[PDB]
Design an enzyme around this catalytic site. Sequence first.
Site, PDB file in Angstrom:
ATOM      1  N   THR A  57       0.794  -1.226   0.000  1.00 31.18           N
ATOM      2  CA  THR A  57       0.000   0.000   0.000  1.00 31.18           C
ATOM      3  C   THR A  57       0.837   1.291   0.000  1.00 31.18           C
ATOM      4  OG1 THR A  57      -1.951  -1.041   0.990  1.00 31.18           O
ATOM      5  CG2 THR A  57      -1.681   1.332   1.305  1.00 31.18           C
TER       6      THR A  57
HETATM    7 ZN   LIG Z   1      -3.200  -0.878  -0.567  1.00 33.76          ZN
HETATM    8 ZN   LIG Z   2      -3.901  -4.116   2.116  1.00 39.08          ZN
END
Ligand SMILES: [Zn+2]
Ligand SMILES: [Zn+2]
Length: 382
Positions: free
Chosen positions: A47
């Site tokens: 992320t």
């Molecule tokens: Zn992510």
């Molecule tokens: Zn994730």
Amino acid sequence: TPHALLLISIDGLRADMLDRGITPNLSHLAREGVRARWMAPSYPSLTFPNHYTLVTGLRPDHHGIVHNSMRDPTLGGFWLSKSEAVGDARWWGGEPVWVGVENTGQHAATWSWPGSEAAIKGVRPSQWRHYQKGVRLDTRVDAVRGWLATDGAQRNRLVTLYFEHVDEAGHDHGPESRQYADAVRAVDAAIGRLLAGMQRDGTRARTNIIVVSDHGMAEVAPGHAISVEDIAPPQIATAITDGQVIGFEPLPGQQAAAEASVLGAHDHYDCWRKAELPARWQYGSHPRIPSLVCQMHEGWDALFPDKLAKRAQRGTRGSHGYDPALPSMRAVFLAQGPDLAQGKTLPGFDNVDVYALMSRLLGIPAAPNDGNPATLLPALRM
Ligand SMILES: [Zn+2]
Ligand SMILES: [Zn+2]
């Protein structure tokens, strides 16, 4: 006054989720504008690294956010819940689009885009916050709507919006679950409410919109979790990270032992010396990457021992962080607005290419980057 750009991230929205009848608002937007078949994340498909790649046009190996959790010889430790690390500009390489915007005299407003809590190259966005859990969908949508409507010297050329809900549901229940689908529907509806509000404010017509995700999501079925210490025992190497991209730093004098145990092909993972990682991942040159890196196979996790125990065993889960070439890891790209094409489909492409498009739409000079400006020129209206 130049056209604003609204940049929206739906964390962990897999590319194929637009074709399941659960995204009426996004699907309509895609039809009106431009839709890529899919967008590949950069390595590692996590992320923080990928959100930061999206706004810089740089691979994680170059921008220095090489994982969600890192160690640096000077800066010490970095992970998501250490605020003064996440907020320290020295971790964040390159020039994110909000810095580019502010340096032209224009303004950027961000809702919790990774990196936006730091003064990167000395420059904060005009609006930003410290991410906290459980903010309502309406709270953030109405804030973004406000920032797009602002005029005078508080006018924002760039507004960013982030949603964690699909990613969270994906981890908890897997990408084929009704919970993941419900999160997708909820985020889609919220974006619908934002678009309707923008029309009522008269901001829709002069705002270009890009919707992306940072990566997809794969199913992690019961029994698909091992201990990081199954890969290397703690006496020979320290696991710097767990999950799917497992970094090991051998203890002093243990490089050979660590290598004898770790390097090569194993049951549900492979490991490499960082300099020897598959070239296609364009990763391993950054000093912050541990000496040995293991990639878990799709649908498998390797966890710190204490997590493995309290992993309440029963049900299907999800993970990303797997080989970015996998269809499961594919992200979304769509865009619509006055400066963008109408009713167009684009081939699958690499997420480093988004930056060059955004720089053009924002009227900023493109910082040096890893992307190809040619790729998204067909997304432009002319
Ligand atoms: Zn992510
Ligand atoms: Zn994730």
